[PDB]
Ligand binder design. Structure first.
Ligand SMILES: [Cl-]
Ligand SMILES: [Cl-]
Ligand code: NA
Length: 129
Protein backbone atom coordinates (compact mmCIF):
# COMPACT_ATOMS: atom_id res chain seq x y z
CA UNK A 1 0.00 0.00 0.00
CA UNK A 2 1.29 3.45 -0.86
CA UNK A 3 -0.10 5.83 1.75
CA UNK A 4 -1.13 9.37 1.18
CA UNK A 5 0.69 11.80 3.47
CA UNK A 6 -2.38 12.79 5.52
CA UNK A 7 -3.72 9.22 5.40
CA UNK A 8 -0.51 7.99 6.94
CA UNK A 9 -0.45 10.83 9.47
CA UNK A 10 -3.94 9.86 10.63
CA UNK A 11 -2.99 6.18 10.83
CA UNK A 12 0.12 6.97 12.84
CA UNK A 13 -1.81 9.25 15.19
CA UNK A 14 -4.41 6.54 15.79
CA UNK A 15 -1.62 4.09 16.66
CA UNK A 16 -0.14 6.45 19.26
CA UNK A 17 2.94 7.85 17.52
CA UNK A 18 2.09 11.54 17.89
CA UNK A 19 4.51 12.79 20.55
CA UNK A 20 5.62 9.22 21.24
CA UNK A 21 8.84 9.62 23.26
CA UNK A 22 8.58 13.31 22.45
CA UNK A 23 8.55 12.98 18.67
CA UNK A 24 5.69 14.91 17.13
CA UNK A 25 3.73 13.29 14.34
CA UNK A 26 5.50 15.26 11.63
CA UNK A 27 8.75 13.49 12.48
CA UNK A 28 7.23 10.08 11.81
CA UNK A 29 5.60 11.14 8.56
CA UNK A 30 8.84 12.74 7.43
CA UNK A 31 10.78 9.59 8.31
CA UNK A 32 8.32 7.38 6.40
CA UNK A 33 8.47 9.64 3.35
CA UNK A 34 12.22 9.39 3.04
CA UNK A 35 12.61 5.83 4.23
CA UNK A 36 10.01 4.26 1.99
CA UNK A 37 8.15 6.98 0.03
CA UNK A 38 5.14 5.89 2.08
CA UNK A 39 5.21 2.40 0.53
CA UNK A 40 4.53 -0.40 2.97
CA UNK A 41 6.13 -2.91 0.57
CA UNK A 42 9.51 -1.18 0.41
CA UNK A 43 12.53 -3.39 0.93
CA UNK A 44 16.19 -2.56 0.68
CA UNK A 45 19.20 -4.79 1.22
CA UNK A 46 22.04 -3.56 3.35
CA UNK A 47 25.75 -4.16 2.91
CA UNK A 48 25.94 -6.62 5.80
CA UNK A 49 23.20 -8.71 4.20
CA UNK A 50 20.43 -7.48 6.48
CA UNK A 51 17.33 -6.07 4.86
CA UNK A 52 15.17 -3.10 5.75
CA UNK A 53 11.43 -3.63 5.62
CA UNK A 54 8.34 -1.59 5.26
CA UNK A 55 7.18 1.96 5.65
CA UNK A 56 9.82 2.66 8.30
CA UNK A 57 12.56 0.43 6.84
CA UNK A 58 13.02 -1.62 9.96
CA UNK A 59 16.21 -3.66 9.82
CA UNK A 60 16.35 -7.42 10.13
CA UNK A 61 19.75 -7.33 11.78
CA UNK A 62 18.03 -6.40 15.04
CA UNK A 63 14.28 -6.11 14.82
CA UNK A 64 12.54 -8.80 12.81
CA UNK A 65 13.17 -12.28 11.50
CA UNK A 66 13.55 -12.81 7.77
CA UNK A 67 15.36 -16.15 7.92
CA UNK A 68 18.37 -14.89 5.98
CA UNK A 69 20.28 -12.56 8.34
CA UNK A 70 22.44 -15.05 10.27
CA UNK A 71 23.26 -14.04 13.81
CA UNK A 72 20.62 -11.34 13.79
CA UNK A 73 18.18 -10.51 16.55
CA UNK A 74 14.41 -10.38 16.34
CA UNK A 75 13.72 -7.82 19.04
CA UNK A 76 10.21 -7.02 17.75
CA UNK A 77 9.54 -10.79 17.63
CA UNK A 78 7.85 -10.60 14.28
CA UNK A 79 8.57 -11.93 10.79
CA UNK A 80 9.92 -9.10 8.71
CA UNK A 81 7.20 -9.79 6.18
CA UNK A 82 4.68 -8.57 8.77
CA UNK A 83 6.22 -5.12 8.29
CA UNK A 84 5.12 -5.03 4.65
CA UNK A 85 1.41 -5.25 5.37
CA UNK A 86 -1.14 -2.63 4.39
CA UNK A 87 -1.89 -2.51 8.13
CA UNK A 88 0.91 -0.51 9.69
CA UNK A 89 0.23 -1.80 13.19
CA UNK A 90 3.23 -4.12 13.31
CA UNK A 91 5.57 -1.43 11.94
CA UNK A 92 4.29 1.10 14.45
CA UNK A 93 4.59 -1.25 17.42
CA UNK A 94 8.09 -2.21 16.39
CA UNK A 95 9.03 1.41 15.76
CA UNK A 96 7.90 2.20 19.30
CA UNK A 97 10.46 -0.30 20.58
CA UNK A 98 13.23 1.09 18.37
CA UNK A 99 12.64 4.73 19.32
CA UNK A 100 12.64 3.74 23.00
CA UNK A 101 16.02 2.02 22.91
CA UNK A 102 18.09 5.12 23.73
CA UNK A 103 18.91 6.65 20.35
CA UNK A 104 15.52 8.03 19.55
CA UNK A 105 14.74 8.58 15.93
CA UNK A 106 18.44 8.75 15.05
CA UNK A 107 17.94 5.00 14.42
CA UNK A 108 16.45 6.13 11.08
CA UNK A 109 19.24 7.47 8.90
CA UNK A 110 16.79 9.30 6.65
CA UNK A 111 15.24 11.01 9.65
CA UNK A 112 18.64 12.12 10.94
CA UNK A 113 19.72 13.39 7.56
CA UNK A 114 16.52 14.82 6.13
CA UNK A 115 14.01 15.48 8.92
CA UNK A 116 15.94 16.29 12.09
CA UNK A 117 16.14 20.03 12.60
CA UNK A 118 13.66 20.82 9.84
CA UNK A 119 10.12 22.11 10.14
CA UNK A 120 8.61 18.65 10.42
CA UNK A 121 5.18 20.06 11.19
CA UNK A 122 5.06 20.82 7.47
CA UNK A 123 4.47 17.09 6.89
CA UNK A 124 1.11 17.16 8.68
CA UNK A 125 0.03 20.62 7.49
CA UNK A 126 -3.39 20.62 5.86
CA UNK A 127 -4.27 17.19 7.25
CA UNK A 128 -7.56 16.71 9.04
CA UNK A 129 -6.57 15.27 12.32
CL1 LIG B 1 4.75 17.72 13.84
CL1 LIG C 1 15.00 11.17 22.07
NA1 NA D 1 16.64 -10.73 12.47
Amino acid sequence: KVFGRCELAAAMKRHGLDNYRGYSLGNWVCAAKFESNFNTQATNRNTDGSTDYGILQINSRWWCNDGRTPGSRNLCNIPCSALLSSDITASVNCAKKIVSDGNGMNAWVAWRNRCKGTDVQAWIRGCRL
